[PDB]
């Protein structure tokens, strides 16, 4: 027929936006699930990396299009809020964008699509929450089983009977039965080479990676300590500007050495006047953290020194110990010191790590550090990642209590209900919600295909079994078919499914609303 001439074509931008964004999602889609396919990337440095981790892939895909990049931010939001599902939030975004593209071709204005999808997302969340299996923080074993599940897909699963309760106790030490938001950044995972995977500890004050003092005269241990955090360097005067010292004999060398030593002595005496017992110096390569000459003075003062402490360790210390940074020896005073019952260096299988316990300070906050041990780098790196993910699982359970079955089950349950319920809606409401619900099946569809199963057969079985059955049914790659995934212990926190529904709506809403790209120069 004859219709809108469409001389000005804003749809050309939205089409470019959707095409670019969906391309990113389809690339990630094929890596979904324990049976997913690997991606290989050649980096700008020429290195070859292989991974099936969606977020790691997305960062290295080096997406250019200003709008397609937003799908990377979505995975970052998922990693920040939930810590899991980072691949699934982009995949659902891609499928929902495909729904939007079809709806646009059907004559639905992008404004209608964005708002209607938001309404569908609201109902999707309600459907998800009602169907979950509730948990309680009071049930320590239940928390261990939740962590143990996420640990069963790690490289060294034989120690999951240890890493699970470690993650559980680490959270419980700082989060009681009545908590909403737990920031697991207060649970510091500290690695050190040596020992074994089970050989871990939970420390209240801090675990540091560095030694204290090895030289003669050092106290090596202090009880009832006040602790300061140093960001300055303690070294003889060493300016950057032009300077010269002339020494023609040992007599002048003696004078010069006394000038250098007296400088450090005055610093060390002021530190003593502040009644500081332990110095924790932030790592820097500008000047010596604490010069040997200063260590001789500080040792005689019975002051412990820990050097080359990483920024991240310093930031944790400022919360666990109740102590404050000192920017310069000029301002080094008591008001900036914390407290601790015991500061000691532990040498276990050559560890030699300084730790603090018994802070008992009003400035302290519920923090905990975990000692990760292991012979090979792969052991301490795998353990840290394993505990981190386990902590993210528990954090999710606090924010929104409960787990749902995996294997695409909540996507079949939500889609199935929405497709039926949408039939009672009017106008664009029903037509759009049918496309929204259909988009959700990209997850159980992809899981079936990556598992080597017939795509239509599995989804057909999932539809039929959910109509007669319940959420517990889903795809099990271990059983290579549709079975009771709850009984197979394939469980994900509610927050992961809830967040994915939200992010998919927010991203598509954001993409559809962009009708132009302009430069600001």
């Amino acid at each position: 027929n004859a219709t809108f001439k469409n001389k000005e074509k804003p749809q050309e931008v939205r089409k470019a936006n959707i095409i670019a964004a969906r391309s990113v999602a389809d690339a990630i889609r094929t890596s979904l699930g324990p049976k997913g396919m690997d991606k290989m990337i050649k980096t700008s440095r020429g290195e070859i990396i292989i991974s099936n981790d969606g977020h790691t892939i997305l960062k290295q895909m080096a997406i250019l299009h200003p709008v397609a990049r937003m799908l990377v931010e979505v995975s970052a939001a998922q990693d920040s809020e939930a810590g899991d599902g980072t691949t699934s939030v982009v995949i659902l975004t891609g499928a929902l964008l495909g729904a939007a593209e079809r709806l646009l071709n059907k004559g639905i204005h992008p404004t209608i699509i964005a708002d209607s999808f938001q309404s569908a997302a609201k109902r999707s969340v309600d459907i998800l929450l009602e169907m979950c299996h509730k948990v309680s923080l009071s049930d320590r074993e239940q928390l261990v089983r939740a962590a143990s599940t996420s640990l069963s897909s790690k490289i060294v699963s034989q120690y999951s009977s240890f890493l699970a309760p470690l993650a559980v106790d680490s959270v419980l030490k700082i989060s009681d039965e009545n908590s909403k938001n737990v920031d697991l950044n207060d649970i510091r995972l500290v690695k050190k080479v040596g020992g074994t995977i089970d050989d871990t500890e939970m420390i209240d004050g801090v675990v540091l990676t560095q030694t204290a003092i090895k030289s003669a005269g050092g106290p090596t241990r202090k009880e009832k300590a006040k602790i300061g955090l140093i960001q300055f360097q303690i070294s003889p005067p060493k300016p950057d500007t032009e300077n010269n010292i002339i020494v023609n004999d040992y007599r002048q060398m003696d004078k010069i050495l006394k000038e250098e030593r007296a400088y450090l002595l005055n610093i060390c005496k002021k530190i003593k006047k502040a009644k500081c017992n332990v110095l924790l110096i932030q790592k820097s390569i500008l000047r010596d953290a604490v010069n040997d000459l200063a260590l001789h003075f500080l040792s005689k003062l019975n002051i412990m020194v820990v050097k080359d402490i990483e920024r991240e360790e310093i930031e944790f210390l400022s919360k666990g110990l109740g102590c404050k940074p000192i920017a310069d020896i000029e301002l080094f005073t008591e008001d900036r010191l914390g407290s601790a019952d015991l500061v000691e260096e532990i040498d276990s299988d050559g560890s030699k790590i300084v730790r603090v316990t018994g802070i008992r300070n009003n400035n302290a906050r519920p923090t905990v550090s975990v000692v990760i041990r292991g012979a090979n780098n792969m052991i301490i790196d795998e353990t840290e990642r394993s505990l981190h993910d386990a902590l993210c699982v528990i954090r999710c359970l606090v924010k929104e209590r409960g787990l749902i079955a995996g294997g695409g089950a909540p996507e079949i349950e939500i889609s199935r209900r929405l497709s039926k319920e949408a039939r009672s809606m009017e106008g664009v409401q029903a037509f759009i919600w049918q496309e929204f619900a259909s988009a959700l099946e990209v997850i159980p569809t992809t899981l079936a295909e990556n598992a080597g199963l017939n795509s239509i057969k599995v989804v057909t079985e999932l539809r039929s079994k959910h109509e007669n059955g319940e959420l517990n049914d889903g795809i099990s790659v271990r059983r290579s078919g549709t079975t009771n995934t709850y009984e197979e212990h394939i469980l994900q926190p509610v927050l992961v499914s809830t967040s994915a529904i939200t992010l998919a709506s927010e991203c598509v809403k954001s993409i559809l609303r962009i009708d132009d790209i302009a430069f600001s120069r």
Binding site: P66, V67, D335, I514, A518, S520, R521
Partner: protein
């Protein structure tokens, strides 16, 4: 051939076209931003690393340069609207572009001289401005209705902004902030604090004028009967009338003995400050340990790094004087309040005032997840508070949703009934521009603007001059029942600015450039 040295030159046919094409190019930047359902624009700088998405028409016009020298004129005019009025930026820019867009056709197709168009627009503008006046209704009486009107205005002025998500709460927060004034319209009495953590729905209004910085290293947490003396002075190693004395020694001990001399001179200066009879001392500059201890020993509560905005806000609350010089105990105004208390808002330290001098001040406390969310929330409040504040002097309103625009275009079409020949089409063209706003509003909302606008016009034409667009249901509704109102003063500004903005470029038919540098 004249000119040279690679200058730009455009003659009647080219410069005239450029004037209109330029203005249209400006309109194309913001035509999508009109209404609560407007579309977003993605902006990216040459570095690629500043990519942002916004529907704020003012940001887009300021962020996106245009190379058309006539477009630069309209953009600069739109800037004035945004900075001086605080609202109407998109509406003026659209109406200006549409008034000039029709003017292009009037010259090329209707054989209308630019001078005829300008005079015709002036006549039509008077009709539109009169239409606003006759349709303008106040509730100056019955304070209950005035307060309600402010809430309805607030919800409208928050439209298209991040705050539109929770407008039910922020409409009352903004309204109460203005109602609290019972006095000056100056927004400098209202403070906004941006705190991370929580949701926007958790924002609070606190009439206690909350300060972002606390006082003292080791000083009491509450000041009773505070007497406020503000400073902008250097107190650090201040060598008073002993200038030119340097410290050169052969030992550290001697140097420390000499540093005492600086303490003695600072002690005199700090003592002279204490002679004012004060409890609280605020310095825009930093206060080193010596003057800090000297204040503490004399019982003076020390605040440092009180920046320009802080000092100016204190002047409007405590009533003190910045006093950059403290050589005499008199010739200074001192402020006062009943209580200064250290208070935690969202686990962040502040001070809370009570009993300040003739208090008209209040603070709106924002709770957001991201800096970008809070930055948009802060600006959105500023814009809404300006219109709500101005309403307290001009209490008349008109109906929105395209209603006022149809009423104005109705008057303009009526004016064209009694008009000379040449100017007739210009007057009708003015009306056609006016009705573009309800067209854009419907289009952005994803509705059929041709049906809604044509039917709306027939409603306003055949009496029923209460109707307007329902941009949520996609139909025509009574704006009084829905509560869709816009400030009379703002509508006068939008029509006035759009009319003059068009005239500026209507008077241009040549572009002359000097040698570039």
């Amino acid at each position: 051939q004249i000119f040279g040295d690679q200058v730009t030159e455009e003659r009647a046919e080219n410069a005239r076209l450029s004037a209109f094409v330029g203005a249209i190019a400006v309109g194309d930047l913001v035509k999508s931003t009109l209404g609560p359902k407007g579309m977003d624009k993605l902006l990216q700088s040459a570095s690629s690393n500043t990519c942002m998405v916004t529907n704020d028409g003012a940001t887009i016009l300021k962020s996106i340069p245009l190379d058309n020298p006539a477009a630069k004129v309209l953009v600069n005019i739109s800037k004035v609207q945004d900075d001086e009025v605080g609202d109407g930026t998109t509406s003026v820019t659209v109406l200006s572009a549409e008034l000039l867009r029709e003017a292009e056709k009037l010259i090329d197709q209707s054989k209308i001289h630019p001078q005829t168009i300008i005079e015709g627009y002036r006549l039509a503008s008077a009709a539109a401005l009169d239409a606003l006046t006759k349709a303008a209704v106040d509730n100056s009486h019955d304070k209950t209705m005035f307060r309600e009107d402010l809430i309805h205005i607030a919800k409208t002025t928050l439209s298209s902004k991040i705050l539109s998500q929770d407008k039910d709460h922020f409409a009352e927060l903004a309204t109460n902030a203005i109602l609290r004034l019972k006095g000056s319209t100056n927004l400098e009495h209202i403070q906004i604090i941006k705190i991370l953590g929580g949701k926007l729905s958790d924002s609070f209004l606190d009439e206690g004028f909350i300060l972002a910085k606390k006082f003292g290293n080791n000083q009491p947490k509450r000041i009773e009967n505070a007497k406020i003396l503000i400073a902008n002075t250097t107190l650090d190693t201040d060598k008073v009338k002993i200038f030119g004395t340097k410290f050169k020694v052969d030992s550290t001990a001697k140097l420390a003995q000499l540093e005492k001399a600086e303490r003695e001179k600072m002690k005199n200066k700090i003592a002279k400050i204490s002679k004012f009879g004060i409890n609280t001392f605020i310095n825009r500059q930093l206060i080193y340990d010596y003057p800090e201890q000297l204040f503490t020993d004399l019982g003076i509560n020390s605040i440092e790094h009180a920046d320009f905005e802080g000092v100016e806000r204190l002047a409007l609350v405590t009533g003190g004087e910045v006093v950059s010089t403290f050589d005499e105990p008199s010739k200074c105004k001192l402020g006062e309040c009943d209580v200064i208390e250290e208070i935690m808002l969202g686990e962040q330290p502040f001070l809370k005032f009570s009993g300040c001098k003739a208090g008209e001040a209040c603070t709106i406390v924002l709770r957001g997840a991201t800096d970008q969310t809070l930055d948009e929330a802060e600006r959105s409040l500023h814009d809404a508070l300006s219109v709500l504040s101005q309403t307290t002097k001009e209490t008349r309103t008109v109906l929105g949703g395209g209603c006022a625009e149809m009423v104005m275009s109705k008057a303009v079409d009526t004016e064209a009934q009694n008009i000379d020949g040449k100017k007739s089409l210009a007057v009708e063209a003015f009306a056609r521009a006016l009705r573009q706003l309800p067209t854009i509003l419907a289009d952005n909302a994803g509705f059929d603007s041709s049906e809604l606008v044509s039917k709306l016009r027939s409603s306003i034409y055949n009496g029923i001059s209460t109707s307007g667009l329902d941009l949520n249901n996609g139909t025509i509704a009574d704006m009084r029942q829905l509560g869709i109102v816009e400030s009379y003063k703002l509508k006068r500004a939008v029509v006035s600015s759009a009319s003059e903005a068009a005239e500026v470029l209507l008077r241009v038919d040549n572009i002359i450039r000097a040698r570039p540098r």
